[PDB]
């Protein structure tokens, strides 16, 4: 399928994956396009946070779905 990953900069990324892929393999593909280690990626989908060890079918991710690469901040 074809999934989207949008960051906190409005940057939308296009990925070519399959429903049998895992969350760990998805984080590996983000590093090959953006350069962010998997330990620094915070992915959100349908109100849930993508954890390692799971698959794209566990969170029910169909075609043309959007993931959100968010961050935590320091100022206050």
């Amino acid at each position: 399928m074809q999934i989207f990953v949008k960051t906190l900069t409005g940057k939308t990324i296009t990925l070519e994956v399959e429903p049998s892929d895992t969350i760990e393999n998805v984080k590996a593909k983000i590093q090959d396009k953006e350069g962010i280690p998997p330990d620094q990626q915070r992915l959100i989908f349908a109100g849930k946070q993508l954890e390692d060890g799971r698959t794209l079918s566990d969170y029910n991710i169909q075609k043309e779905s959007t993931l959100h690469l968010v961050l935590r901040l320091r100022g206050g």
Binding site: E34, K48, Q49, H68, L71, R72
Partner: protein
């Protein structure tokens, strides 16, 4: 002409151009309820031209649950008149006025932006047609208990100069092609990060002069390192070098009318788990306005029949809509939940949407961010008790109390819990002030057995007044905590706030001891650094107390909640580190302005504070020489040489002696070291690959001659000689004419670049003047202060950074931008701060009620420049297991330190305790950073520790005896389980 001292933190989120467009824009705020005062607060702090209030209703009781400016003795008066002097006090540059009823066409003509809050729809439709047809920015925001909506109509032609708020990215050119669609290749190890459709500009590209200084041209991303440009057929032949600069072009957007968007709605999702809700809530708010036409009042709290009336009305509105907006399925329960909390007015929801609605007003008269197009619906329906069956006849009924707007949603019992809450607020900054304000409106800590502890070490500065509304320009030089408590005690006299001035950390463990965290019910963070966040996180795990974490950065925000025995802690996850400049490309080979600003900040610390601190320790501590000789290589000689320079060599006595030093250090830093660098690397030396050395990230420097008439050369000497004299305590002048006349008589020593070490150190220890030789002399270090335009601090950095930028042909930056990088100022605005704090207190409603399901909590993430709103449930705490027992991050080993006899437990009894009671062969024991026991210990180290008690071992290795306040001890283990192999285990609470 704009006050950079007040808007310092805000000019880094809007810019000078968009700020000037705010200075000439009048805003009208209609409806001064809880939502109306919040919107008007951030607008006045933002610095518009003038704000005008408007309201026809009286200050009822049900309005005090969120309006922080309606006192308990103002009930019955006009809301716009009483809150006018209070709002007019936030910004001394924005005149605030009120109005007493007429919303005529001639009154709206003198405004640019108009905000409609808590106004009937039929009355909003008339204003919407007029404003759109005459070019008046319209914002409509309504809040109904847990629900809320936001609408914008900036006309059908709005120019956007910035559609994302992110700074332009840059990249260095490797090769560009002479094809019809030219192909540009960036340098390796540096991704361009651009997007297809962006516009770039070229500079410093030699061989294609036509491509330089050109205007924006569209690009297509061909990969992580390449992209295409315009036509390159009839262009010159490329050579080498270049730099690509991203440029954002202004684009136009169109908004439909209010009456047209109400028929054809464009939604912006706030909760992606609630994707189909904005469509359903669009029908509920329309039925709520029509409900006021049938019964003349908002629906009663809870109740069955009034909820059934909205369901019957929503079905009629769904049928009378267009066949593309009509929903085939209606959510009956969602509209009935809307009827229950319809008559509610909650401070958090008002603070959240009020922060967003205020931000949309900033976008309207500035065109700086992408606005909401066009509807924004949000609901905090998870704050209600989990499946709990509570009746409205005793609780939700109004009691003519100030909490009627909040009890109508939750209840009197849930209000009595808040009065008995004890919370610890760590910080009184932007987030700290918003939390204290919401604390007063919510009612937490306002009872007999409640307390709010506010601690903060910082004093009120002028820059804090732009977002921390609890402070006034006459509260400068006062403690934030003490002043913020006095402001909250006026918004709610029932609250009980204690204000400390203690910096939370490992040094203040005595004040916030074990007994302090016991009676606490939760902690709310409001910090501006990551070290204090990690420290507060570890303590909330040790004491099992909930923590509400929040952070902002410009238009971005995040909210994370940590519930004991439920979710992971704040430290369980990791964040990317800050931009770390390699020492190589920082000291010798800079390429951007940040490399010289970071260099100029290090020049300030190492040239003024560092030598003075060493001289003072050399003249005070008798064991200073021995301490410096003990540490590292080529570091004793660096520090001992600096002491010799400051004591005898570079020691000034007169002001004229400081001017000569500033001129000598100038030639050494911007001429001598440049010639020394060019001597080791000629301007045309090849690398190992036969490529020019000065290419790409390495810019070829050039020596700089001292011209006394050049102000940049003079601005450096004036700031350097003064800061040099302040270090030794000498009177520094500011006459730039006499110094320049004196500079033409200074002699500069000749410099020729050049192409056992302990023997030089053995002479320095003998040539150093004894402290008894010169009694009385002392130097004074200079702490770096950014927000003071009179200490010559920023005057030095800008002159030091731009002078180095001229060496490496780097475009200089003004003192406003230099203050951002060198001062490491984090941009902040009042709208983002108020937005996240409103989300924080929403989860606070869940902590005081005790939610044990992860479905009820929501971690927030915001970016108001996109605009983005995302929520995700907190991750369950990781569950690990050793053999038959599995443990969580919130689990601990309880070991009673002292025994049946008065003596203390020994190390041998400790190891055998885990072998017999827990079946754990302990192989590594450590307390903090010191290690106590391990399998690879020397035989002698094991003998002198088995029979000694645990406290005697820790005090033996840590070189520090345990204090009298220590009541327990945390131990880390790396043991072997009954399975066979190594395994991780929980920590140990060793109670003395």
């Amino acid at each position: 002409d704009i006050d950079e001292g007040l808007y310092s933190r805000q000019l880094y989120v809007l810019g000078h151009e968009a700020m000037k467009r705010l200075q000439t824009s009048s805003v009208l705020v209609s409806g001064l309820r809880g939502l109306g005062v919040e919107i008007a607060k951030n607008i006045i702090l933002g610095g518009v031209k003038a704000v005008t209030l408007h309201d026809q209703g009286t200050a009822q009781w049900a309005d005090l649950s969120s309006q922080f400016y309606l006192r308990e003795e103002d009930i019955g008066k006009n809301r716009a008149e009483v809150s006018q002097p209070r709002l007019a006090e936030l910004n001394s540059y924005v005149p605030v006025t009120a109005y007493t009823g007429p919303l005529v066409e001639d009154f709206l003509s003198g405004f640019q932006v108009v905000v409609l809050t808590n106004t009937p729809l039929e009355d909003q439709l008339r204003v919407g047609e007029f404003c759109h047809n005459r070019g008046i920015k319209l914002v409509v925001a309504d809040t109904r208990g847990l629900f809320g909506q936001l609408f914008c109509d900036f006309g059908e032609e709005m120019i956007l100069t910035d559609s994302n708020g992110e700074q332009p990215l840059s990249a260095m050119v490797s090769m560009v092609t002479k094809d019809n669609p030219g192909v540009v290749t960036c340098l390796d190890e540096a991704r361009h990060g651009f997007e297809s459709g962006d516009f770039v500009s070229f500079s410093e590209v030699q061989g294609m002069v036509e491509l330089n200084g050109n205007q924006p041209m569209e690009i297509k991303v061909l990969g992580p390192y390449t992209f295409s440009i315009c036509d390159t057929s009839n262009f010159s032949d490329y050579i080498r070098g270049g730099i690509v600069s991203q440029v954002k072009v202004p684009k136009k957007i169109s908004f439909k009318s209010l009456v047209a968007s109400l028929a054809e709605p464009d939604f912006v999702v706030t909760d992606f788990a609630k994707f189909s809700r904005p469509a359903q809530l669009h029908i509920g708010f329309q039925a709520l306005h029509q409900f006021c036409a049938q019964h003349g009042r908002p629906p009663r709290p809870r109740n069955e029949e009034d909820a059934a009336e909205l369901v019957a009305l929503a079905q009629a509105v769904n049928a009378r809509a267009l066949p593309a907006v009509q929903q085939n399925n209606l959510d009956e329960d969602l509209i009935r939940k809307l009827a229950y909390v319809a008559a509610g007015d909650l401070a958090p929801i008002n603070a959240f949407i009020g922060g967003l609605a205020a931000q949309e007003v900033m976008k309207a008269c500035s065109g700086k961010f992408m606005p909401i197009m066009q509807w924004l619906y949000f609901d905090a329906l998870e704050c209600l008790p989990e499946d709990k069956e509570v009746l409205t006849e005793d609780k939700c009924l109004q009691r003519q109390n100030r909490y009627d707007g909040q009890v109508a949603v939750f209840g009197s019992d849930l209000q009595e819990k808040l009065g008995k809450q004890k919370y610890f607020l760590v910080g009184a900054g932007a987030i700290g002030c918003e939390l204290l304000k919401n604390f007063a409106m919510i009612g937490l800590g306002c009872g007999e057995g409640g307390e709010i502890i506010v601690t903060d070490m910082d004093t009120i500065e002028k820059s804090n007044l732009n977002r921390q509304f609890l402070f006034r320009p006459w509260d400068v030089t006062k403690l934030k905590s003490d002043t913020a408590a006095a402001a909250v005690r006026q918004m709610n006299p029932h609250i009980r706030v204690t204000s400390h001035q203690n910096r939370v950390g490992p040094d203040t463990e005595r004040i916030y001891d074990d007994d302090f965290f016991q009676n606490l019910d939760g902690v709310a963070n409001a910090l501006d650094n990551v070290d204090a966040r990690m420290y507060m996180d570890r303590r909330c795990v040790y004491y099992r107390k909930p923590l509400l974490e929040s952070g902002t950065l410009g238009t971005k925000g995040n909210v994370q909640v940590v519930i004991p025995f439920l979710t992971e802690s704040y430290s369980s996850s990791q964040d990317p580190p800050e931009k770390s400049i390699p020492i190589a490309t920082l000291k010798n080979f800079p390429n951007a302005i940040e490399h010289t600003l970071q260099w100029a900040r290090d020049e300030f610390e190492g040239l003024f504070k560092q030598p003075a601190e060493n001289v003072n320790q050399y003249l005070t501590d008798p064991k200073f020489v021995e301490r410096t000789l003990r540490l590292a290589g080529t570091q004793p000689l660096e520090v001992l040489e600096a002491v010799q320079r400051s004591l005898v060599l570079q020691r000034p006595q007169t002001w004229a002696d400081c001017v000569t030093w500033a001129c000598h250090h100038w030639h050494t830093q911007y001429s001598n070291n440049i010639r020394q660098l060019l001597h080791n690397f000629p301007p045309d030396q090849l690398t190992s690959s036969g490529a020019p050395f000065w290419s790409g990230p390495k810019r070829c420097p050039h020596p700089l001659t001292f011209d006394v008439n050049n102000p940049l050369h003079l601005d450096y000497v004036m700031a350097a000689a003064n800061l040099f004299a302040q270090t030794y305590g000498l009177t520094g002048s500011q006459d730039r004419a006499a110094v320049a006349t004196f500079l033409q008589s200074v002699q500069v020593p000749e410099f020729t670049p050049k192409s056992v070490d302990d023997s030089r150190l053995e002479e320095l220890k003998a040539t150093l003047p004894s402290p008894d030789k010169l009694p009385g002399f002392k130097m004074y270090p200079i702490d770096f202060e950014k927000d003071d335009d009179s200490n010559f601090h920023m005057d030095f950095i800008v002159a030091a950074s731009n002078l180095r930028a001229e060496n490496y042909d780097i475009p200089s930056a003004d003192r406003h931008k230099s203050k951002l990088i060198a001062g490491k100022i984090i941009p902040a605005i009042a709208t983002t701060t108020a937005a996240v704090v409103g989300l924080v207190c929403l989860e606070l409603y869940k902590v005081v009620q005790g939610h044990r399901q992860l479905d009820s909590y929501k971690n927030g993430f915001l970016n108001l420049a996109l605009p983005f709103f995302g929520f995700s449930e907190p991750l369950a705490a990781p569950r690990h297991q050793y053999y038959n027992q599995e443990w969580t991050l919130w689990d601990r080993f309880e070991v009673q330190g002292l025994q049946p006899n008065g003596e203390e437990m020994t190390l041998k009894q400790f190891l055998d305790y885990f072998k017999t009671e827990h079946k754990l062969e302990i192989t590594m024991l450590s307390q903090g950073v010191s290690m106590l026991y391990s399998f690879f210990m020397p035989a002698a180290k094991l003998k002198e520790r088995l029979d000694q008690p645990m406290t005697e071992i820790v005090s033996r290795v840590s070189k520090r005896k345990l204090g009298r306040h220590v009541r327990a001890l945390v131990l880390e283990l790396c043991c072997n389980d009954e399975s066979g192999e190594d395994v991780e285990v929980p920590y140990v609470r060793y109670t003395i």
